Design a binder for this molecule. Sequence first.
Ligand code: CLA
Ligand code: CLA
Ligand code: CLA
Ligand code: CLA
Ligand code: CLA
Ligand code: CLA
Ligand code: CLA
Ligand SMILES: CC1=C(C/C=C(\C)CCC[C@H](C)CCC[C@H](C)CCCC(C)C)C(=O)c2ccccc2C1=O
Ligand code: SF4
Ligand code: SF4
Ligand code: SF4
Lengths: 75, 39, 80, 150, 738, 118, 144, 61
Amino acid sequence: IIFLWTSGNLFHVAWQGNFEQWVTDPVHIRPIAHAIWDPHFGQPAVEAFTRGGASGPVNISTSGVYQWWYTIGMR
Amino acid sequence: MKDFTTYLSTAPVIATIWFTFTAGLLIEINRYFPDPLVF
Amino acid sequence: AHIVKIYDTCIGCTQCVRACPLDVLEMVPWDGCKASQMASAPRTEDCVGCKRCETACPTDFLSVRVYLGSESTRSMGLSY
Amino acid sequence: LNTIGWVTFYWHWKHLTLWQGNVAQFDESSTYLMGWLRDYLWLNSSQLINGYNPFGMNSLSVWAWTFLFGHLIYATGFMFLISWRGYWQELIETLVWAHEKTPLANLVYWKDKPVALSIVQARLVGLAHFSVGYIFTYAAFLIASTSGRF
Amino acid sequence: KVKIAVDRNPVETSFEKWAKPGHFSRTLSKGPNTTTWIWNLHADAHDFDSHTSDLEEISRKVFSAHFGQLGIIFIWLSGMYFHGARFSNYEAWLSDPTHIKPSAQVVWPIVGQEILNGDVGGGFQGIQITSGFFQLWRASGITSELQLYTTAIGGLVMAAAMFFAGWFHYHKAAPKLEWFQNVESMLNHHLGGLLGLGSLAWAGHQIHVSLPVNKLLDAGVDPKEIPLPHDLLLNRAIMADLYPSFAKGIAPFFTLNWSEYSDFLTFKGGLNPVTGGLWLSDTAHHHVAIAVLFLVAGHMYRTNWGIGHSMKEILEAHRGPFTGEGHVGLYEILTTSWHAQLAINLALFGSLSIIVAHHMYAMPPYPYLATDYGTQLSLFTHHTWIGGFCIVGAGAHAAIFMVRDYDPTNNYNNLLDRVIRHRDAIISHLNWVCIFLGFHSFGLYIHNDTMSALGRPQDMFSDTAIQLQPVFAQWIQNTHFLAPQLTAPNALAATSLTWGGDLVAVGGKVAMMPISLGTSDFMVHHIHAFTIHVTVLILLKGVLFARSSRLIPDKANLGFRFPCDGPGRGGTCQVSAWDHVFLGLFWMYNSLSIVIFHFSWKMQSDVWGTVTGVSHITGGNFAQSANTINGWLRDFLWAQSSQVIQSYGSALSAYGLIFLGAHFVWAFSLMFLFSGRGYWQELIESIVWAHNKLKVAPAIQPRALSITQGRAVGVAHYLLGGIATTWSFFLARIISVG
Amino acid sequence: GMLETPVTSAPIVATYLSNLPAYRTGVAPVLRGVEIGLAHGFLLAGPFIKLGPLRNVPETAEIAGSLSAAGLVLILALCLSIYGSAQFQPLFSADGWSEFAAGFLVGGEAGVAWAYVC
Amino acid sequence: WTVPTLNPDTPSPIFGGSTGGLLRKAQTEEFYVITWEAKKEQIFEMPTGGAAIMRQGPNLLKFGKKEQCLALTTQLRNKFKLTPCFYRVFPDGKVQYLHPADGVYPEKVNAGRVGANQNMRRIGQNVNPIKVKFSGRMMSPAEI
Amino acid sequence: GPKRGSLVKILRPESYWFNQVGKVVSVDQSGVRYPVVVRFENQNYAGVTTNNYALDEVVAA
Ligand code: CLA
Ligand code: CLA
Ligand code: CLA
Ligand code: CLA
Ligand code: CLA
Ligand code: CLA
Ligand code: CLA
Ligand SMILES: CC1=C(C/C=C(\C)CCC[C@H](C)CCC[C@H](C)CCCC(C)C)C(=O)c2ccccc2C1=O
Ligand code: SF4
Ligand code: SF4
Ligand code: SF4
């Protein structure tokens, strides 16, 4: 379960994050955790959670995995 | 009168008198010696 | 069903018997105490575990003990 | 939960006053508990509770909803911690009567007999709701304040 | 035969039993062995049923106890008048009510607490009071501090008379049991003499003292220049100068030409526009009518002559097919059980206090009261709390009757029996309706929170989205506003401004305006209905299952107050009716806190404020914000606690200190509420060992508090904490922004 | 004994409860299911249309309301099926309750489809 | 003394009917039936709530659990000085007599009783829970 | 065993008055297992001030 959890973190960062854009300017770009598909949303929520730089609504990660992965060599 | 002084010897009455004495002693000290922080 | 045990410190005061709201305990002939009476628990299948018996016992420590075991419909006191 | 709440209030407020620049604010206000309640809890929860409002919403609305969500789970755990079993068992016995006497619904009948939660189970469920609401409330406040003001 | 029945010298006045703690109880007179004893000594001190079985001795005890209470209250009133005379700014306030803050408490200059003596105006420094005594004194026509001092001495004398009456009617001449059981005579004397002669003599005081002095005070003449009241009684020509009716004397009264008394017995309605209070002429006519009504009501029951009704005959006469024997047996219950009487009187006395709160906010009876926003908030909140507590008490003593006094072999197929006999149906229906109310009332708030959070405000329950208008309340409001035209022809205005109409302002502040009702008011009223129904559920379940339940068939033998019946049968914690009072106390706190929050926010938002249009204190945010929980959290609690949290370094700093202290006490209660005495007893065992090691173990054995005392301490500190928190919040807020 | 009441022991109430399809004692469980479904799906089609999230978009309010009503009828039929799977191990049997749940599915979908036309 | 039998045709006390009566446990599992012989007509308190007039002679009530029958037995025994006995009835019609199963009430000693569930030791002489680990179930050390 | 009125000391470890001092009331001379009747000036958690003990559970100290 621990290794499946870590593989899921890696997969959702690789597919839905902005990791290849984060590493160029890591001071001014917010790390993206995973995309939001919530059909209960309205259009102001879809507009407001589309922060940048994303296509749709995303969550901004606080778990710190981009700094750890960028330090240990992920690019 | 013996029973009245026995009642005055009970625990809440003596606690009231003694805390009135202690609080009044502290109040008079903080009046005549205003705001002591040191010494 | 709960576990009710009687220990040899019983002095046959009958207090536990007259405290049970379910008629589980009874007094048997015995020779271990001056009262020649000892408690016994032949009907522990109807015991709910309220512990009134333990409250009624005068001895230190208790001579009747209720160990809450597996629950049934009778031990849960269910009328349904 | 109390002790880790103290160490994280302390950590978070000393680092917020470091990150803003005015460590003098922490040095002046941390020596008395009204300074805590005014300058860390009241002050740093302005943009949190403005996550949604009758004028609109922004990206902090999820942390405002989670903040209220944690207050609610905390409060619901107080019910299991304060009120105890026999009240609820008498209430469930009246509910059992009410279901078995109502026509056209008593054709449906339970397989497991409904009873109240046990005493140990009550303590575990109350402590569980208590702790989950504690964690969600402080995580919502911490993430929303630190991300909204920086 | 109704007559005076008294036993001579029952109990010797002696200091002997003062020196023997717990003399009243055979268990407690043995002395203290463990610490539990002390708590028992204070818990059962006034439980006279556990002292004696003899109803006569109990009745005497409660009679003298009541006298003690009255003497204490008279000491309290004496204190308020004395502090109003000696340590206040009442005269200065009389000269300028709109710009001087009522203050009647001053602190001594030690340890810096002198800062609490703030600038209240009138060349005075003290604590601004919100009890409303100044407006009551101005309405009564008091003008000088001397009259207040004289009232203080009078009330002290009356306190001494009440304590003498207590000692006398317990130790020297103590009434017999059949004196107390004359309930028909008691109702006659209290309805005639107390309410009737009370309101008659008060209407006398009003018509002869209040009306002229307050008419001159509204005219503008300096208070010192106004004639003293005895000159108003003595020279009737002055009374004819203000109201010419007084020239004719009492000749129109006896000749039934009462229409000529329309100068001072009016039916104006509304408020005095220069003063913001009800017309004292309306209040005088009101008290005269009330007087005549109650004196008529006090001649209903038969005493020593043939005329008059009989209570048992009226009770036994109302019997139907659905109820069987009907009200038979209730007379015997209510003339032999003090707890049943106490339950009825507490329920109606609490309800009456809540009605007092609503009618006094809506129809301000005192001059310069409506614009003293702090006084209005304080009075409403206070009397609402008192009300709630007395209702919970009613449920408590109802249950105490049910366990100790209920005896079905004089009470067999009766109203009470049928209630006990279909209690499962009653509680199950109340259960369902409580869940229904909870789901739909609270669910609208959660629904709104979700829709507002999801960026879909058009899907909310609000005045602009899905509307839920209070059509019935609006219709009743409109009808009562249109009432003076058709269904009340002799009324000049409506009974209250809140129905609709214009606006009465005094000194730039809004006294009262029409209160509008929308979706938010609909939602809070159904929240109120929900919480009240749940409280009723707990208390009523407590009283109906006090004797037996399917869980505990012999609960009556365990008493009214007992912790449980053991961990068996799944667990029986809090099965006693006392524990139902304990939970009802928490739920009563919940309900009334939401009620006073409703009142506070609504008044500050849609009613109060200054007149330039009207600028309200919070700009009118209620209608759009009071539909989400986040709205209450931010716009009410968070926004309005600014004043309390920044009150340091000023005269309101004590409200900040009591804010923190109340939060502390509330949290402190959770230790008692969430834990149990086994842990604490074992901890005390370790500590006792430590004391034994140093030869300091007490002879009275340290014991952990009982289960029920743990619950009692818990709920008491919980209530004290929460209520005092809202107290400090309210007072600091309304005094600073008022 | 049981408390005698003119609500629990009224004659016209007893005849009305005997006439409802949960009590007729001799009709098929499929027929009971389709009648109960034609009642309940037809009444459940309403509030999804009038109060649902697509209630103000024209030409699609009734479609989404009936589609959500049909989804709820399918969830209710699954609930009936698992209740019968857990309860019995003519109406009160495993085969009879499975026929009753299938009849409720058919009758509820037919009631929603008839409410879309109406 | 011999074991008595249940007479189903025993007149019940005068009672209007409560909501705290029997449930489906009486039809599916069991219900318990109490019987006593009264000396006069007198009102007693029903343990399920309400008052009831007993008849002069035999009486018959049926309850849902054993504690209701003990509560009525204790009430009729301490207040009215009567000698009741309550049975156990199954939906097959099986009748199980108990209380007093000896015939003499259990609050006084009678010869012929065999002591059950009696440990012949103190409570401090129980073994530790390490000695009864890894049995077929949970065991308190007082079980042995 | 010990005589009436003499002070003894309790060695039953699961007793409330273990390692404490009481006063002998009577010693039963039959074959009873716990004949020594000792009163104590302080009560236990059950409010009782009297217990029966064996011979090897009391020491006249
Ligand atoms: C002044 C002379 C006097 C004397 C010597 C006595 C003596 C006695 N009275 Mg009597 N009695 C008196 C005056 C007196 N009484 C008065 C003024 C009243 C009216 C209240 C009564 C009404 C009365 C009743 C109804 C009863 C007695 C009883 C007794 C007997 C025992 C009571 C006792 O010992 O507890 C002494 C009690 C106290 C010392 C505490 C006083 C509590 C005061 C009144 C309450 C107010 C305090 C106040 C709220 C402050 C609180 C502040 C804050 C901390 C909250 C004892 C012979 C009892 C009896 O005979 O039982 C068999 C009894 O039932 N008395
Ligand atoms: C009933 C309610 C009530 C309350 C809450 C207050 C409250 C107050 N009064 Mg007011 N007062 C009252 C009624 C009240 N008063 C009445 C009825 C009178 C007319 C007698 C007065 C006349 C009065 C004056 C003249 C003054 C006050 C003052 C005060 C303030 C300080 C009190 C103080 O520190 O005393 C001093 C503290 C003590 C004396 C503590 C001793 C307590 C003893 C030791 C207890 C012993 C226990 C014993 C068994 C029970 C008492 C028996 C009794 C017969 C002595 C305080 C706000 C003062 C003030 O406002 O300053 C600006 C002030 O000067 N009051
Ligand atoms: C018409 C005459 C009359 C009046 C005015 C009252 C008034 C009162 N009675 Mg009632 N009482 C009466 C006749 C009357 N009673 C009769 C005939 C009986 C026997 C059937 C009773 C039996 C009775 C009992 C058992 C009790 C009362 C109590 C009360 C008080 C209720 C507390 C309150 O809210 O009052 C508001 C308070 C006031 C208005 C304060 C002013 C009171 C003064 C003394 C004026 C009242 C007149 C008084 C009766 C005259 C006494 C003269 C005396 C020197 C002989 C109230 C003072 C209760 C009480 O509290 O006892 C102490 C109580 O327990 N009464
Ligand atoms: C209930 C309270 C009350 C009281 C105490 C009064 C009192 C009074 N009213 Mg008022 N009044 C009232 C209610 C009251 N009123 C109400 C409700 C209305 C509205 C309908 C009025 C409308 C009204 C009007 C229009 C007038 C009054 C007037 C008066 C005064 C004279 C009345 C008179 O002649 O009575 C008859 C006389 C008596 C009853 C005498 C009392 C008995 C004496 C004291 C007995 C003494 C006997 C003793 C042995 C002798 C002393 C011996 C000793 C020295 C040793 C008197 C002060 C008149 C007035 O003067 O206005 C300013 C007046 O014009 N009243
Ligand atoms: C008309 C008013 C009234 C009267 C005369 C009574 C009378 C009684 N009540 Mg009832 N009751 C009432 C209203 C009343 N109650 C209300 C308003 C409630 C709701 C709280 C109740 C709920 C209630 C319960 C649950 C119980 C009673 C019981 C009793 C009986 C014994 C009380 C006793 O001896 O306690 C002694 C008095 C005390 C221990 C006083 C301390 C109470 C708290 C701790 C003080 C509150 C804090 C204070 C306001 C401020 C603190 C300030 C500062 C120190 C921090 C006595 C018949 C008891 C009983 O057994 O009846 C047979 C009982 O169990 N009452
Ligand atoms: C905020 C915390 C909280 C909450 C939510 C509750 C809730 C409740 N209390 Mg409790 N209570 C509380 C605090 C709380 N209490 C505390 C602190 C105490 C100790 C004093 C008590 C002591 C107490 C007593 C003595 C009693 C209650 C009762 C109740 C129930 C009232 C019936 C009702 O309205 O159902 C409606 C349900 C709600 C209002 C809960 C929220 C429902 C949400 C908004 C909608 C549900 C849909 C949901 C979102 C779907 C989830 C799907 C997901 C799982 C996938 C209700 C469940 C009473 C009872 O059960 O009798 C009827 C009762 O007698 N409580
Ligand atoms: C409990 C209070 C409550 C109420 C009244 C509503 C109401 C609504 N919600 Mg909201 N909702 C709630 C709580 C509530 N919600 C909570 C607590 C949450 C967060 C968990 C939400 C989250 C939410 C979302 C995400 C959405 C809604 C939506 C809606 C709307 C349509 C829902 C729908 O179609 O259901 C179908 C309706 C039924 C199945 C009705 C069943 C009830 C019937 C009428 C009972 C009949 C009893 C009858 C009188 C008995 C007669 C007996 C006789 C025949 C014998 C409707 C206005 C939708 C919307 O767009 O809002 C506008 C939507 O998208 N809600
Ligand atoms: C804290 C706590 C205790 C411990 C609290 C106790 C024992 C009360 C202690 C009160 C005071 C501090 C002890 C008595 C003080 C005496 C007056 C001694 C004189 C002291 C002088 C300074 C006056 C319980 O006993 C308990 C029981 C049941 C549920 C919850 C709890 C619970 O939470
Ligand atoms: S168990 Fe306790 S109570 Fe019952 S007999 Fe033995 S000793 Fe007396
Ligand atoms: S627990 Fe309840 S049932 Fe079991 S013995 Fe003690 S009392 Fe009798
Ligand atoms: S002791 Fe406390 S917990 Fe154990 S049963 Fe009695 S009440 Fe419930």
